Design a protein around this ligand. Sequence first.
Ligand SMILES: CCCOc1ccc2cc(S(=O)(=O)Nc3ccc(C(=O)O)cc3)ccc2c1
Lengths: 60, 238, 60, 57, 57, 57, 252, 271, 271, 271
Amino acid sequence: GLPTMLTPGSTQFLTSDDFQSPSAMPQFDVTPEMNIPGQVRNLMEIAEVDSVVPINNLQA
Amino acid sequence: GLPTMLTPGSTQFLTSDDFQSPSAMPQFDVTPEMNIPGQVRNLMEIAEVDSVVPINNLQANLKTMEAYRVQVRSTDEMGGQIFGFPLQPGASSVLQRTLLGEILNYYTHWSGSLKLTFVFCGSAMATGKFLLAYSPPGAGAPDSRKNAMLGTHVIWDVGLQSSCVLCVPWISQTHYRYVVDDKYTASGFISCWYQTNVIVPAEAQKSCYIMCFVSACNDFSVRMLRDTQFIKQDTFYQ
Amino acid sequence: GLPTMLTPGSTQFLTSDDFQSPSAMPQFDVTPEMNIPGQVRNLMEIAEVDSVVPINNLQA
Amino acid sequence: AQVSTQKTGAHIIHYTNINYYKDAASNSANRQDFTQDPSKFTEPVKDVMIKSLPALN
Amino acid sequence: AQVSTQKTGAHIIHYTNINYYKDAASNSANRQDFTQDPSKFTEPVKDVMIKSLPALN
Amino acid sequence: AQVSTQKTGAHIIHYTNINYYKDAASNSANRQDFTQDPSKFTEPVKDVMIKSLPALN
Amino acid sequence: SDRVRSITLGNSTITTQECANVVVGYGVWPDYLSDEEATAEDQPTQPDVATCRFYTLNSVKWEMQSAGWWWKFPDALSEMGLFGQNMQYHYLGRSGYTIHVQCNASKFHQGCLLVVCVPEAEMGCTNAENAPTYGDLCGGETAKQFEQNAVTGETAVQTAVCNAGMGVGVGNLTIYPHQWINLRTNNSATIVMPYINSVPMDNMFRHNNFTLMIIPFAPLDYVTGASSYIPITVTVAPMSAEYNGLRLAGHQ
Amino acid sequence: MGRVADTIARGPSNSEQIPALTAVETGHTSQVDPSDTMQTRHVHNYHSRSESSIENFLCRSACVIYIKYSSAESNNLKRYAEWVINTRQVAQLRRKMEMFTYIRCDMELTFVITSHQEMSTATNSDVPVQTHQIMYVPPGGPVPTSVNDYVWQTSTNPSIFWTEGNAPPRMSIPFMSIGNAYTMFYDGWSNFSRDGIYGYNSLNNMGTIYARHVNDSSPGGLTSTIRIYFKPKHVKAYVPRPPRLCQYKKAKNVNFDVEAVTTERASLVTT
Amino acid sequence: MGRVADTIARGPSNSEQIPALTAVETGHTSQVDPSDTMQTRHVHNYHSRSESSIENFLCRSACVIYIKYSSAESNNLKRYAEWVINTRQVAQLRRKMEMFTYIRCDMELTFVITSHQEMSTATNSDVPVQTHQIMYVPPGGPVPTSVNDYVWQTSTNPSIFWTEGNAPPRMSIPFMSIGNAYTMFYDGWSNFSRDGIYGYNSLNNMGTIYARHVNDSSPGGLTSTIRIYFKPKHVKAYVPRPPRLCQYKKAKNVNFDVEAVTTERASLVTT
Amino acid sequence: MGRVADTIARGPSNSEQIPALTAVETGHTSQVDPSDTMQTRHVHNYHSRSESSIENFLCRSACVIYIKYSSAESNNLKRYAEWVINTRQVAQLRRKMEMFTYIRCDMELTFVITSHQEMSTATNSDVPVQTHQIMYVPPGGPVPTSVNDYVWQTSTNPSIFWTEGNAPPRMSIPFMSIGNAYTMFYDGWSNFSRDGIYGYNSLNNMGTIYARHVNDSSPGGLTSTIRIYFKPKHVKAYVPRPPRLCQYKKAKNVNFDVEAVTTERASLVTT
Ligand SMILES: CCCOc1ccc2cc(S(=O)(=O)Nc3ccc(C(=O)O)cc3)ccc2c1
């Protein structure tokens, strides 16, 4: 075949990688999308919302 | 899949390779750069800076400030040789723990000219003249001032300008020399002699000092990275 | 990753191959060439030169 | 082939991706979509509230 | 694809690199940047000192 | 990419090479350079000797 | 002539009539922080002339067996004028400096000093299990002194010029902005240090941006019957001082 | 290119020009060439400073630690190992980086993981090929207290899984200091009081690596040792420093022992 | 880009504008910046919200189960193992997904399969390299009752065959809910009566994984343990929820034990 | 192309032209063809000198040494091995290069690393797959004195890490002589005195290879032997020399024993 050479990390499973892998249901037809209110795209859309602060968090 | 064939060195970890590897923090946003004064891009920006040379590195003087200064005086004769050392800026006791010499001990090769600056640290009423000499090798170190002036030399005249540079030129059979001492790659000899004498008034000191500095010129380069022999350990630091 | 398949001779070391391999001194600056008289490029530049023939190669 | 900018700083910088599969579930995850709309949680009010004005007039 | 000259002598000589990742930290190290500026260590003086002239007039 | 003829007979016939490294020492050996100059060993004489003429006139 | 100079900052001015140029460290002259390198979002106070102006420190006696002196910054100016007051009330500061060393002598005296400003001059300790304490790193306006030979202690700084108090060749403190004062040439050194850090601003008590070290490389020497007291005075002005994070005074 | 200066041809001189004379009381260092002190010929010079770049100097993998762990817990190694990330437990790599005060760089981490059989009173061993996990736990994450606990689920923690008999695994790490460069030397303290930790260890807070066997223990014992290699990449370095003179004592201090500047000579004049 | 807002320069003010004052009785939350409450300088800010996307947050592989099986059947593990697919048997991965009510995503399943030698009275072991099958059986498919039965023919059932000493095997799975998104929380019942299972487990019906050794048993015993890792990809999430406060009890219920809001303090004023 | 000369058709001759007669007292050698000494036909000749290039002659990998090392230190091999780099310890590769006086070339180094079990009084062996390090130490670098010392950190020293059961590892080396070509024969001395080492070994200073097991020793013993293979590439060679007649004695000298020019014949006339 084509001459190739393997480089460090050739068989690793890194949990923060993104690689392509074959689907186990080829040609599967997914359900149509619909609009569901309140789509989140970022966690700074949750962090910028007020939240009551427990400033009186004594033992009792 | 696509027909491929593995070739020698397919699973090796070479420590001098450069290959791409997946990041373990995908989409990580790094801190912005800002200008920090004194950016280094090359180690020949460190080697071309002067560094005080310990030319008086005898056993008693090693842990003291005597190391970096050689006494010079008003002699009752001509005065002989002041110092001399084999040139070899990475293997000589004199030159190898300077900035030039410690950037040299991460490499196995070097080439180019270097410049030894000297400074008279006497009184302003003290004045002298000195013969700063370089002798290319193959005839040994000069043992007289006569033999020292057959080589490359600068006659230094002490005046308002307090320093004088003996630039020592490359002059080598090979394009490079080894950082290690090797008899094939022999690099010559440096010496200093009295050309006149230090002449000084009665009320000013008869003894003075001289320091030496060393740095690379603009034609200087190094090749072939290696571990330095100047740092070591017997167990991990904790 | 990209689908690939290994073919016979994938890990062999053939001594008459020519393949690329990473340098162990990356960015090393070699000495300049100079002209050295008598460059050989072929061994038929050595074979076409006369050589004395031992035609009297008896034991003594 | 799709050529797209890499994540890079601050004050070459592209990569190439080719899809090798017939499904879009096989594709690598989309990590470079940075669209936001915090206003449907942070400001979910019928009348637009102007910051400099009183909340309640 | 980026096509760039190899390190070669003295008195073909290109290689091809394609980046395969979405991060620039994943990229191979830059070894061919040879810019210098020794003057900020070697000559860090307010007034420009001309070599042929006295240092101190 | 460099496309160059293969060694082939006598009485397709190209291959493709791409260099993958930043050094030219990493490259495969040059085996297709067939230049010669035997005359500096075989005829290293100051005066050109013509074959049909006497060597020594 | 090149030997005469004045530097005017604020309501202070220094004159020299022997000097060996001015070193601008790393070729960068002090300036205020830009909007593209900022990260503190409150308005910076810039007291200008009231903080930027020469402050003369306590003088040290140069002796024949002296091994050197050091002052850490900004903690040598922590009680100096309104520069030191704006350190008290602010979390962040950021300043460049012009450091000017004075040491005149007669023409029948000899000696040579290295005057060097070392960024991030973290120092060792006599005992290898312990950190040096603040009283041994810093004297404020008073200098801490190097010793000729090795010292012992528990929290004492390891002082010994050969190691420079940092475990490095003392002769190699020349890649740092530096001048020499050689008594047969010049009587003053001037270094202009920019602000150098890896953060755009930092607290002024918890961190020392650089240390000025003055180290004799050729001992003081003179014939008896000449002046035997020769001081070294360090007068240093802030430049482009600005501060952020105003709150109550203190630092604890 | 990184090519060096050519030598320029020069004849006899006799002038009031004085390139040789200078004052070193300026911070400036002389710019003299051989073409100022003697005759000289023109030399066209092709030498390069290519390999003396800081991105070639620092860009070779260096071992920074190794740590051991054992299936049996034979010799007090536990069933997992840990290492607080730093670059200061090894002399060689540390010295190279400490020639600079600030460095910003990306890293490339390569792991060389090996195992060996241990003495045991077990008879008959036919232990499967080991798999190992290497987990990076960012500051303030939960930490292993055993080999079996919930922390090894790696739901957000970056992790490598690798099986023996394969190429060494590697991952890139980006620049990730709080500051705009890593700080090699810090002349401050961690408290405004000016107490607590002094030195660069104040600013050290780079998380912890944990490593275990993923396979359950077999009747004998295996110890695995993992060697961690860092290679700087994409480097910019600032503020050159002297190389170290003294041997290090500690990985959190610079404390040093007083040592000689240079080695002995017999006299001022040697050949 | 995901770059954040710049700070805007602001001077002294004295006006009837009141950015600071607001009513929180509106569902609206204040939009105040520092440029409304004090002076402020202009800061050009290059920070990004790149890694706080939901497709970077959820897109790291997390262990969801492990299950064991044994050649010998040494310790009651059978010769095959099974797992009813769910995401709720692990705390860490579950919590991240339960910050949303509906999620549609594709998955990527990676398996980390290890084996170990077991105690036995067997002598002489030289067991070949194990091969393993991982079979996915969609709802209402025939199921293994033994390691040898006809169900492992995998004529329509998706299946992986993998041999030890190789890279972990993985397969993508597409979005495959009956609905238009997966349901993390269901406030309904499975009956119109309002009886039966209550909660999200009503809508859980995602099939079963089975895993066996493909090799016939050898005279000793090997136990193999397979760890299953799910990584969300291509995610859209809807309806943010609070993160969990309480530890979970059960993988089919949300039942919880009453727990403290926050940790103790000595008093209202602490330093 | 490298194609050879065609034969040219030639008829009867009778002229004062004398191609056959020449003087060999000139350094020149005759240029006669068959077309000068007899009739001859035209032959179009397609033969090539392609494989008789010096870059095909020298460009096949040749073993230059092997060196052994042992985990147990069974038979005085230590736990690491060393070799001062040279090309002169093997007859075959040496002879090919010594047909030239100066050669500049790049090298390609391939290593063939094998291990074998040793006799021991140990019982029960199940030793993991060995990993090995091959470290190149340039001249004047620190050297191993043990298998455990700091020199194997390889912070600037080039190094290979390789695990058994994989393709032989290789690395290119560039041209790296101090001179503008490697020197095969040096008729000088290393001293100006004309003392010390004489010969080509004066100019030999090519560093040292070290090789160890990276794995800790296991209860039995393994010896590993590493065979080093050099292949010239990108060659230019200068100054042809005779091939050797005599067998070599030493790897640092050319000293030789007097040997016969050719083999015997019975008489001047043989058939
Ligand atoms: C068995 C008990 C433990 O024995 C020892 C003996 C000697 C030791 C020497 C060192 S070091 O030289 O400071 N650092 C090294 C770093 C990396 C490597 C490597 O192998 O890559 C080698 C050495 C560290 C720990 C040591 C433990």
